[PDB]
Amino acid sequence: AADLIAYLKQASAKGGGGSLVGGGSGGGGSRPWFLEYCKSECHFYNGTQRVRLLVRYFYNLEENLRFDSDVGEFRAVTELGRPDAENWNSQPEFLEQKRAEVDTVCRHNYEIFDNFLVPRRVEPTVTVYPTKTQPLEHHNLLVCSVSDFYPGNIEVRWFRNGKEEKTGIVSTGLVRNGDWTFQTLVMLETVPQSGEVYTCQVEHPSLTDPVTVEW
Amino acid sequence: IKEEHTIIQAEFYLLPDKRGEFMFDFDGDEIFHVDIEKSETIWRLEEFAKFASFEAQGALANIAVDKANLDVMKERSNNTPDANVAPEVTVLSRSPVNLGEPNILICFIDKFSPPVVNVTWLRNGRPVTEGVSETVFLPRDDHLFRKFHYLTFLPSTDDFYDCEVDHWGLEEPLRKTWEFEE
Numbered sequence: 378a379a380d381l382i383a384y385l386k387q388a389s390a391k392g393g394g395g396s397l398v399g400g401g402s403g404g405g406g407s408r409p410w411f412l413e414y415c416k417s418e419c420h421f422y423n424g425t426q427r428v429r430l431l432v433r434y435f436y437n438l439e440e441n442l443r444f445d446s447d448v449g450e451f452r453a454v455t456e457l458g459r460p461d462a463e464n465w466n467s468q469p470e471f472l473e474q475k476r477a478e479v480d481t482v483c484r485h486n487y488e489i490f491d492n493f494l495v496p497r498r499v500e501p502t503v504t505v506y507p508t509k510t511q512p513l514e515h516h517n518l519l520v521c522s523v524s525d526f527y528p529g530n531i532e533v534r535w536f537r538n539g540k541e542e543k544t545g546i547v548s549t550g551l552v553r554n555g556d557w558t559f560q561t562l563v564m565l566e567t568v569p570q571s572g573e574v575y576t577c578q579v580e581h582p583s584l585t586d587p588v589t590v591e592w
Numbered sequence: 593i594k595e596e597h598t599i600i601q602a603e604f605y606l607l608p609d610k611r612g613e614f615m616f617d618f619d620g621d622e623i624f625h626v627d628i629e630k631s632e633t634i635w636r637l638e639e640f641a642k643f644a645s646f647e648a649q650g651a652l653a654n655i656a657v658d659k660a661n662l663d664v665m666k667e668r669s670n671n672t673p674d675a676n677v678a679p680e681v682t683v684l685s686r687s688p689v690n691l692g693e694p695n696i697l698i699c700f701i702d703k704f705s706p707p708v709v710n711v712t713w714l715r716n717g718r719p720v721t722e723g724v725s726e727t728v729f730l731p732r733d734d735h736l737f738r739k740f741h742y743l744t745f746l747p748s749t750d751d752f753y754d755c756e757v758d759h760w761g762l763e764e765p766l767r768k769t770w771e772f773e774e
């Protein structure tokens with residue numbers, strides 16, 4: 378279940394000939410930097426069923442060339458990428474390899490990751506509590522803390538005596554920790570009466586049943 | 593059911609720093625990157641190793657091409673440069689903070705370029721070099737980068753943290769504070 382991951386092969390750009398003028402570049406008398414950056418994106422619309430390979434090339438701050446498997450050959454996003462488009466598209470040996478990568482790289486790799494990344498599940502830790510201290514200036518914020526969960530697919534809703542509170546909701550949105558876990562705070566703004574019961578419901582794939590916490 | 597996912601092979605080479613990177617991303621998170629020097633594969637989470645493997649040499653071969661290509665791009669544009677793009681910094685706890693319970697502080701560096709930065713964790717005004725870790729330069733949807741720095745800590749009302757970040761696109765270093773808020 379530990380097959381070897383495949384990588385998209387980088388192609389050699391050709392120089393010697395050509396040069397562009399007036400490179401409308403921010404400049405800004407700061408420290409000159411030069412970056413060759415490439416992103417090969419495998420998009421899966423339903424597992425390997427349908428796939429789209431999107432390769433994008435950036436020189437410094439601009440995308441100057443790409444390869445979209447929906448098109449089948451390279452296209453220049455800016456003039457600076459025009460020479461490479463013409464060169465690689467002329468190499469049929471290469472255009473084939475690239476087209477094949479949707480299978481040899483994208484689908485290949487997906488099958489490997491489908492064994493541990495696609496099914497990764499970490500159940501959220503759900504907590505509810507009153508915001509601030511006692512002094513209630515104008516509102517009394519109720520915090521529903523949902524943390525340490527994965528994937529990001531989650532639904533956090535507030536209820537007041539069974540009714541779902543739409544307005545008065547304040548969220549930090551989905552927060553990515555960079556370590557394969559997310560966290561979020563969904564706060565409710567209300568004006569309690571007496572025997573008013575508030576509930577935070579959390580739905581997430583890791584769960585077999587929604588999770589509710591009352592206050 | 594319909595599984596929608598994105599795997600991105602992100603690589604780059606930068607001058608004059610002479611630095612490169614090669615990593616894989618899954619729905620926004622790092623699966624692994626290759627240490628260009630050691631020439632070894634580094635899995636974001638240890639547990640990933642038992643399910644797959646990657647020949648590091650592949651990353652280095654590609655970096656060599658990215659390196660050669662970088663030179664061509666510089667010739668093709670008469671070494672014209674763009675402006676440096678400063679990052680936005682955000683500090684935050686990984687999870688809810690309870691006094692006495694081990695936790696982790698996160699210094700999130702976002703939307704910047706080139707992929708080079710200097711980060712320093714500060715606890716009570718002093719640089720902390722123990723219990724810190726960081727991610728390589730992570731990709732965004734655009735052409736900019738993001739990075740995560742981490743500091744292990746024990747919540748307390750007597751400690752005061754600062755994440756000091758420096759970039760060629762900043763006039764003065766960016767300094768973000770964080771302390772236990774009840």
Ligand SMILES: *[C@@H]1O[C@H](CO)[C@@H](O)[C@H](O)[C@H]1NC(C)=O
Nearest residue numbers: 397398399400669670671672
């Ligand atoms: C930079 O490119 C311009 C073309 O617009 C050229 O005239 C100039 O001489 C180049 N830089 C140098 C070598 O001065």
Ligand SMILES: *[C@@H]1O[C@H](CO)[C@@H](O)[C@H](O)[C@H]1NC(C)=O
Nearest residue numbers: 422423424425426593594595
């Ligand atoms: C998605 O792919 C699966 C096979 O993996 C298939 O059963 C399903 O019909 C496809 N489309 C839908 C409706 O999700």
Ligand SMILES: *[C@@H]1O[C@H](CO)[C@@H](O)[C@H](O)[C@H]1NC(C)=O
Nearest residue numbers: 708709710758759760761762
């Ligand atoms: C980052 O720190 C290094 C010290 O090793 C220094 O050479 C470099 O100038 C610093 N980067 C910036 C943007 O100042």
